[PDB]
Amino acid sequence: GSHMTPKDDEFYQQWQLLYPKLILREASSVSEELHKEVQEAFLTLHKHGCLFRDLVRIQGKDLLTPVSRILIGNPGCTYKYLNTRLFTVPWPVKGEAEIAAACETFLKLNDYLQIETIQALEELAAKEDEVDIKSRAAYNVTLLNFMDPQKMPYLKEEPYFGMGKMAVSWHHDENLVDRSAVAVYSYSCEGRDPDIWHVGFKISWDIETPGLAIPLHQGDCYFMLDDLNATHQHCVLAGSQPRFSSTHRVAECSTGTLDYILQRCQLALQNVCDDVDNDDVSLKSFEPAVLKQGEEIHNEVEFEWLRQFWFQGNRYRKCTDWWCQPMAQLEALWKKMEGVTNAVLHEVKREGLPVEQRNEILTAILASLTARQNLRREWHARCQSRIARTLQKPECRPYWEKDDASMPLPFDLTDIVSELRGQL
Template identity: 60%
Template sequence: FLFQWKTKYSKLVFRKSDTVPEELHQMVQESFLTLRKHDCFFQDLVRIKGKDFFTPVSRILIGNPGCTYKYLNTRLFTVPWPTEGYEIKYCSPQIHDACKALIKLNDYLHIEAVKALQGQNLLESKETEDTPVIDREQNFATSLREKGSVSQDQSSFCVPEDDFTSLNSRTSYNVTLLNYMDPLQMLYLKQEPYFGMGNMAVSWHHDENLVERSTVAVYSYSCEGSPAEETYDQKLQGRDPAVWHVGLKVAWDIETPGLAIPLHQGDFYLMLDDLNMTHQHCVLAGFSPRFSSTHRVADCSRGTLEYIFGQCELALQNLQTDSNSGALSLKSLETAVVKQVEEIHNEVEFEWLRQFWFQGKRYLKCTDWWLKPMAKLEEYWRKME
């Protein structure tokens, strides 16, 4: 197990719950329960291979104001966490506190990810090919026992400024996708097909629409001590089906053994550098309900309000208003200009307005922050129409 982890999955960093400040645990876990109590988790309607499905996992996206995240053809809109310079009205003080706790977790995981990448770089530069495998495995096992993680705390490292800027940008999380699932409420869970790992809450996949080589950080909170866990006392080999796990495999490879890491209350893990692209991961269900907070550097080059408002203003440069009648008309009828305007028109309608409204009034359970910008987008759309 340790040999496979070290040689095939070395960019997966795992940290036990006792490495995280207890105060942060308490704040974050209370935020999960608060959002659940206020019915803020929703199953997403997604499209896979041309067919529409509701996800078995319920989710909510929290992050930078005006930021969105798209996966499986569905665009999610952030419930904005408290951000300086933005006026955000939450539906209750409890939801404000929950979002505030999650940005604190976000800041903590950012720092831990930078440390882990620094440690990874140092290990790669020091490790030589003639180092005996048994020595590397022994050192790895010692690190895992002593630190509760794959790589040690490297907070004292000194790195060049350019390298630090790169590490910082690849770990500056702008969104977190929160997940909730109670396996006992599911009528059916798909079986892991390649390694016999058992029930899957989330099938094998890469995370989509992320900044290249950015780190993904996942904090896990399973409601341990549930009646289902307490009544389960079967001796078995391999993965304990009562415990949640994250599974990893080399992408498009079922010959290399997969890895299943148990996740207990308050553990977190990091998928460093290009691991999300070279490998696939899944989530293996346990018996108890589970929350997770998955922090990502979303590629927002086409997914922010700033971007889409800029596109609208570009399109409306071709619009003129008659000074007498107030009627609108086009300045230019050149094919390239008209085509560009229509492409922006369609982008506003199909990538923003329809995506927002088909999800109903889910966001109003947390905040009305998105209503004004969406009204502004509708106004732009009417002018382009």
């Protein structure tokens, strides 16, 4: 197993024949105006401490990420990677001061890279509607990254091609719009040179075709066009210096915007008599499908939104308070839904209800309350791991003790979920 750099004579033809949807636009092709601003914006965001390592999860194991990142993008948009939902620090489009300046820079960078990507995708088609090109370049977020490699005690070796040290292992960028492009601005402060940063590429499934290691110098950009991200894997090979990147994506956010999740809560609350907001929650229907939907939405807001947000110790507050009202509002909507689950439970215990209507209700809601119990343990335990204790550390929220009648239901549902089974 081997790899090719610009030192190898075969590099230039292997690029053209086995990695042609990869494009490089070097520092020289980007205006000096933009370089200074974009690099000052990285240094700005680093100074204020806006970039954090994430307490991610992979195959059961709780792991801290080598690199430090922040997500910037459209207001209300999220990007999920490695079971962790990141929330946009918003950039200004259609309606704390140094930080708003940096976000606007990365919007300016976003606009530039978009025109470069559309252009590059035109040229790819000429070789091989025009709305498809537009939507596959319509970047809604950028994930900024940072790693000082001298503050890692030992870096993993690249295992298939001898590319040396890896900052990020071989992967695909998850959760992107199908065939969408990715644009990356890179900024560093025998085989491949160990002191220089490279992006590595290989074909999926394949360690026989030699991989490419693309040297990245101060302000070089690369572009993964079309189905590249799916057919190929990439890695980041570490240099000796620290290095930033801004990686612009079209995040598949069909169930990942503030608007989308508010609307889902609005949908669950259609089954609640809504004259007044108090603890007397009563429901319009107990038709199985309506109750199932309500309980599924309760989980969605709790686990995809509330617990994902508060697991990040309010690292967002530091740079922006955009998500503060939204998340208070989502919690209150979730709290009402606790009221709903309580009201459904009340109804199944009613002397008066035919067992036949009771059993049809349980089959509607049990998978949802099952899944609420398991994920509550997973999230609670994940907030309590020895690694998490070491610290703005991860808050388990919402959480409440049994001796607390502000909440209609208990956090531990084992009593409750177990009782509903023995019947059915």
